[PDB]
Amino acid sequence: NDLIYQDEHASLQPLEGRTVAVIGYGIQGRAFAANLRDSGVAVRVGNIDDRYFELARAEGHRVTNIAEAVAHADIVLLLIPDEAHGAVFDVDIAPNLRDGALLCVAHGHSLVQGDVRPLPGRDLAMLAPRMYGDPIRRYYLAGQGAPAYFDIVADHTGRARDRVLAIARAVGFTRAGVMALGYRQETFLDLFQEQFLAPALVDLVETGFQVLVERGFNPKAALLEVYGSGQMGKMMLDGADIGLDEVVALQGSPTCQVGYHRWRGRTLPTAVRELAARVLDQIEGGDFSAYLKEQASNDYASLDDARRAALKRPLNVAHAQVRAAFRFPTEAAGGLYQA
Amino acid sequence: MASNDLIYQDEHASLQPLEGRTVAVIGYGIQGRAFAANLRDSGVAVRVGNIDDRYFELARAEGHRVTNIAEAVAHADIVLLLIPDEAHGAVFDVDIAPNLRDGALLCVAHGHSLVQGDVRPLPGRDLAMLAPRMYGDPIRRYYLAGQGAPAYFDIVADHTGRARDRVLAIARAVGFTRAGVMALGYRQETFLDLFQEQFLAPALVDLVETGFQVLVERGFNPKAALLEVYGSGQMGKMMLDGADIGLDEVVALQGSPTCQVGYHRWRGRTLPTAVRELAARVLDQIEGGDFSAYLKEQASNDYASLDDARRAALKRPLNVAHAQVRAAFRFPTEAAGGLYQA
Ligand SMILES: NC(=O)c1ccc[n+]([C@@H]2O[C@H](COP(=O)([O-])OP(=O)(O)OC[C@H]3O[C@@H](n4cnc5c(N)ncnc54)[C@H](O)[C@@H]3O)[C@@H](O)[C@H]2O)c1
Ligand SMILES: NC(=O)c1ccc[n+]([C@@H]2O[C@H](COP(=O)([O-])OP(=O)(O)OC[C@H]3O[C@@H](n4cnc5c(N)ncnc54)[C@H](O)[C@@H]3O)[C@@H](O)[C@H]2O)c1
Ligand SMILES: O=C(O)/C=C(\O)C(=O)O
Ligand SMILES: O=C(O)/C=C(\O)C(=O)O
Ligand SMILES: [Mg+2]
Ligand SMILES: [Mg+2]
Ligand SMILES: [Mg+2]
Ligand SMILES: [Mg+2]
DSSP output for A218-232: -HHHHHIIIIITSHH
Q: From B321, B262, B136, B285, select the one nearest B202 (Cα to Cα).
A: B285
* Overall CATH class of domain B2-189: alpha beta
Q: Say if CB A193 and CB B211 are below 8 A apart.
A: yes
Q: Say if CB A211 and CB B276 are below 8 A apart.
A: yes
Q: From B24, B12, B5, select the one nearest B65 (Cα to Cα).
A: B24
Alpha carbon B273 to its chain centroid, in Å, reads: 29
Determine, for residues A254 and B148 on separate chains, whether the beta-carbon distance falls below 8 Å: no
DSSP A74: S
State which H helix or E strand residue B236 sits in.
Answer: helix B234-245
DSSP A327: P
Q: In whole angstroms, give the CA distance from residue A157 to residue B76.
A: 76
Report the amino acid identity of residue A83.
Answer: E
State which H helix or E strand residue B254 sits in.
Answer: helix B247-254
Resolution number, Å: 1.4
State which H helix or E strand residue B212 sits in.
Answer: helix B201-217
Q: In whole angstroms, give the CA distance from residue B146 to residue A327.
A: 12
Per-residue burial over A198-212, b = 16 or more CB atoms within 10 Å of its CB, e = otherwise = bbbbbbbbbbbbbbb
A289 contacts chain B (CB < 8 A): no
For every residue of B100-132, DSSP letters joined together read PPTT-EEEESSSHHHHTTSS---TT-EEEEEEE
CA-CA-CA-CA torsion for B113, B119, B124, B125, nearest 10 degrees?
Answer: -50
Please list every residue in chain A whose beta carbon sits closer than 8 Å to the beta carbon of residue B182. Answer: 218, 220-221, 325-326
How far, in Å, are A209, B1, B256 from residue A79 at the CA level? Answer: 37, 46, 10
Q: In whole angstroms, give the CA distance from residue A172 to residue A143.
A: 8
Q: In whole angstroms, give the CA distance from residue B182 to residue B81.
A: 20
The partner residues of B80 in beta bridges, in order of sequence, read: B25, B107
The partner residues of A151 in beta bridges, in order of sequence, read: A126
Q: In whole angstroms, give the CA distance from residue A216 to residue A236.
A: 28
B257-266 vs A297-311: helix crossing angle, rounded to 10: 50
Pocket of ligand 1 (CB under 6 A): A 24-29, 47-48, 50, 52, 79-82, 84, 88, 105-107, 128-129, 132-133; B 254-258
Q: Say if CB A92 and CB A73 are below 8 A apart.
A: no
HSE-up of B194 (CA within 13 Å, CB side)?
31
Q: From A149, A202, A21, A209, select the one nearest A97 (Cα to Cα).
A: A21
How far, in Å, are A145, A166, A217, B234 from residue B137 at the CA level? Answer: 23, 36, 28, 21
For every residue of B62-99, DSSP letters joined together read TT--EE-HHHHHHT-SEEEE-S-GGGHHHHIIIIITTT
For every residue of B8-64, DSSP letters joined together read E-GGG--SGGGTT-EEEEE--SHHHHHHHHHHHHTT-EEEEE--SSHHHHHHHHTT-
Q: Say if CB A219 and CB A318 are below 8 A apart.
A: yes
CATH topology of domain A4-186: Rossmann fold (3.40.50)
Q: In whole angstroms, give the CA distance from residue B251 to residue B246.
A: 9
The vertex-A268 CA angle with A263 and A272, nearest 5°, equals 160
Per-residue burial over B188-214, b = 16 or more CB atoms within 10 Å of its CB, e = otherwise = bbbbbbbbbbbbbbbbbbbbbbbbbbb
Q: In whole angstroms, give the CA distance from residue A230 to residue A327.
A: 11
Report the amino acid identity of residue A67.
Answer: A
Q: Say if CB B63 and CB B342 are below 8 A apart.
A: yes
- Burial class for B175, CB neighbours closer than 10 Å (0-12, 13-18, 19+): buried
CB atoms within 10 A of CB A99: 10
Q: In whole angstroms, give the CA distance from residue B76 to residue A4.
A: 57
> Pairing mode, if any, of strands A75-78 and A102-105?
parallel
State which H helix or E strand residue B250 sits in.
Answer: helix B247-254
Report the amino acid identity of residue A307.
Answer: R
How far the first Cα of chain A sits from its last, in Å, is 39
Q: Say if CB B149 and CB B184 are below 8 A apart.
A: no
Report the amino acid identity of residue B120.
Answer: R
HSE-up of A286 (CA within 13 Å, CB side)?
3
Residues 257-276 of A with CB under 8 A from B: 257-269, 271-273, 275-276
Determine, for residues B224 and A254 on separate chains, whether the beta-carbon distance falls below 8 Å: no
- Method in brief: X-ray
Please list every residue in chain B whose beta carbon sits closer than 8 Å to the beta carbon of residue A266. Answer: 202, 206
Q: In whole angstroms, give the CA distance from residue A43 to residue A76.
A: 10
Closest Cβ–Cβ partner in A4, A219, A230 for B328: A4
Q: In whole angstroms, give the CA distance from residue B155 to residue B125.
A: 12
Q: Say if CB A189 and CB A40 are below 8 A apart.
A: no
For every residue of B126-159, DSSP letters joined together read EEEEEEESS-HHHHHHHHHTT----EEEEEEEES
Kindly list the strands in the beta sheet with A148-155, ordered across the sheet, starting from the edge strand earlier in the chain.
Answer: A4-5, A178-180, A148-155, A123-129, A102-105, A75-78, A19-23, A42-46, A63-64
Report the amino acid identity of residue A155.
Answer: D
Q: From A111, A7, A109, select the one nearest B262 (Cα to Cα).
A: A109
Q: Say if CB A249 and CB A239 are below 8 A apart.
A: no
A198-214 vs B247-254: helix crossing angle, rounded to 10: 160
Q: From A227, A188, A24, select the one nearest B250 (Cα to Cα).
A: A227
Q: Show the DSSP H helices in chain A as ranges.
A: 27-38, 51-58, 66-71, 85-88, 109-113, 133-141, 160-171, 183-192, 198-214, 219-223, 231-242, 244-251, 254-263, 270-284, 287-295, 297-311, 314-325
Over its C-alpha atoms, chain A yields an Rg (Å, rounded) of: 22
How far, in Å, are A98, A111, A157, A160 from residue A120 at the CA level? Answer: 11, 16, 11, 14
The vertex-A229 CA angle with B212 and B291, nearest 5°, equals 70
Q: Say if CB A192 and CB A283 are below 8 A apart.
A: yes
Please list every residue in chain B whose beta carbon sits closer than 8 Å to the beta carbon of residue A186. Answer: 224
Q: Show the DSSP H helices in B267-340 as ranges.
A: 273-287, 290-298, 300-314, 317-328
The vertex-B254 CA angle with B251 and B256, nearest 5°, equals 85
Kindly list the strands in the beta sheet with B126-132, ordered across the sheet, starting from the edge strand earlier in the chain.
Answer: B7-8, B181-183, B151-158, B126-132, B105-108, B78-81, B22-26, B45-49, B66-67
DSSP helix/strand/coil, A49: coil
DSSP helix/strand/coil, A43: strand
Q: Say if CB A5 and CB A162 are below 8 A apart.
A: no
Q: Say if CB A25 and CB A47 are below 8 A apart.
A: yes
How far, in Å, are A97, A256, B39 from residue A71 at the CA level? Answer: 6, 60, 62
Pocket of ligand 4 (CB under 6 A): A 130-132, 190; B 234, 255-256, 258-259
Q: From A4, A110, A300, A272, select the one nearest B276 (Cα to Cα).
A: A272
Alpha carbon B333 to its chain centroid, in Å, reads: 21
CB atoms within 10 A of CB B293: 11
